[PDB]
Amino acid sequence: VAVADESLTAFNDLKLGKKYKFILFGLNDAKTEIVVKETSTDPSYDAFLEKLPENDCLYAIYDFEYEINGNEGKRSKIVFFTWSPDTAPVRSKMVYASSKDALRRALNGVSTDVQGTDFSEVSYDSVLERVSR
């Protein structure tokens, strides 16, 4: 496997440039590379779980943005989601499981990781709670 030279370029953009609000990667039609399947600059979070393939897997790097009180202001944390519902093809889940670290390691700056195996274990309060404590 491998990662599209354009895949990380999109990450380096959303990070230092805050270009996109998040990215949706995934194995190419040939299953040998990780190309950015989708990107968006939409703030709302209830729009992210709306682009999640209910019956499919994929990698996503969100730029979580929440509020704090200790240092009055907003804080951001890059999250690494890992979609893999109970509906996704078993043959398409084992390929997204192994070639997972392929992306993970390639990206430096990722704060938290979240495995997606249920729409409830990827919700706001779920990702936010694990983004602080």
Curated annotation (Swiss-Prot):
Entries under PROSITE patterns matching the protein: ADF_H
Keyword match Lipid biosynthesis: no
Domain of life: Eukaryota
Transmembrane region(s): none
Main location: cytoplasm
Subunit structure: Interacts with actin and AIP1 in a ternary complex.
Chain's role: Controls reversibly actin polymerization and depolymerization in a pH-sensitive manner. It has the ability to bind G- and F-actin in a 1:1 ratio of cofilin to actin. Binding to F-actin is regulated by tropomyosin. It is the major component of intranuclear and cytoplasmic actin rods. Required for accumulation of actin at the cell division site via depolymerizing actin at the cell ends. In association with myosin II has a role in the assembly of the contractile ring via severing actin filaments. Involved in the maintenance of the contractile ring once formed.
Keyword terms: Actin-binding, Cytoplasm, Cytoskeleton, Nucleus, Phosphoprotein
GO molecular function: actin filament binding
Gene that this polypeptide is encoded by: COF1
Annotated protein name in UniProt: Cofilin
InterPro entries listed in its UniProt record: ADF-H, ADF-H/Gelsolin-like_dom_sf, ADF/Cofilin
UniProt PTM comment: The N-terminus is blocked.
Compartments, record wording: Cytoplasm; Cytoplasm, Cytoskeleton; Nucleus matrix
Further comment found in the protein's record: Present with 19600 molecules/cell in log phase SD medium.
Keyword Phosphoprotein annotated: yes
Pfam family, any one: Cofilin_ADF
Entry's Gene Ontology cellular component terms: actin cortical patch; actin cytoskeleton; cytoplasm; nuclear matrix; plasma membrane
Residue ranges occupied by any ADF-H domain in the UniProt entry: 1-132
Family per record: Belongs to the actin-binding proteins ADF family.
GO biological process: actin filament depolymerization; actin filament organization; actin filament severing; endocytosis; Golgi to plasma membrane protein transport
